[PDB]
Amino acid sequence: MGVQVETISPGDGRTFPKRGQTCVVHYTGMLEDGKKFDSSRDRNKPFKFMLGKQEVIRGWEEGVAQMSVGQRAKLTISPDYAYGATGHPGIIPPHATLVFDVELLKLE
């Protein structure tokens, strides 16, 4: 599968990230069993990435683009849209479906 987006709290429902814009997010990343492997919130610093530059996984590129500014949403990302068969040694196992809690704070 690709990326499924499930809303957690609504944004403005009007402003959506466009290619080339910087997305400022807080996020928490978890394996399918629920184990947290990454979280910008634990570092108390929002994560920024530029949409369309493939600085993030494909599930992020296509999933965050579906979110409006101020929205919090749950992205469930299949391995093809994620770290694939290889995964990430000692962080993400092979063929892993990942669940991201993502809040889109603003666009720059």
Swiss-Prot record:
Source organism's superkingdom?
Eukaryota
- Modified residue N6-acetyllysine is at which positions? 53
Any transmembrane segments, and where?
Answer: none
The yes or no answer to whether the keyword Cytoplasm is present is: yes
State the EC number(s): 5.2.1.8
Location in the cell? Cytoplasm, Cytosol; Sarcoplasmic reticulum membrane
- Entry-linked Pfam families: FKBP_C
| Membrane topology label | Peripheral membrane protein
Enumerate the GO terms in the molecular function aspect.
Answer: activin receptor binding; calcium channel regulator activity; FK506 binding; I-SMAD binding; macrolide binding; peptidyl-prolyl cis-trans isomerase activity; signaling receptor inhibitor activity; transforming growth factor beta receptor binding
Output the InterPro entries linked to this UniProt entry: FKBP-type_PPIase, PPIase_dom_sf, PPIase_FKBP_dom
Q: How is its activity regulated?
A: Inhibited by both FK506 and rapamycin.
Q: Keyword set for this entry?
A: Acetylation, Cytoplasm, Isomerase, Membrane, Rotamase, Sarcoplasmic reticulum
- List, for all copies, the residue spans of the domain called PPIase FKBP-type: 20-108
Per the record, the GO terms for biological process are: 'de novo' protein folding; amyloid fibril formation; heart morphogenesis; heart trabecula formation; negative regulation of activin receptor signaling pathway; negative regulation of transforming growth factor beta receptor signaling pathway; positive regulation of canonical NF-kappaB signal transduction; protein folding
Catalyzed reactions:
[protein]-peptidylproline (omega=180) = [protein]-peptidylproline (omega=0)
Disulfide-bond pairs as recorded = none
Family in the record: Belongs to the FKBP-type PPIase family. FKBP1 subfamily.
Q: What does this protein do?
A: Keeps in an inactive conformation TGFBR1, the TGF-beta type I serine/threonine kinase receptor, preventing TGF-beta receptor activation in absence of ligand. Recruits SMAD7 to ACVR1B which prevents the association of SMAD2 and SMAD3 with the activin receptor complex, thereby blocking the activin signal. May modulate the RYR1 calcium channel activity. PPIases accelerate the folding of proteins. It catalyzes the cis-trans isomerization of proline imidic peptide bonds in oligopeptides.
Q: What is this protein called?
A: Peptidyl-prolyl cis-trans isomerase FKBP1A
Source organism: Homo sapiens (Human)
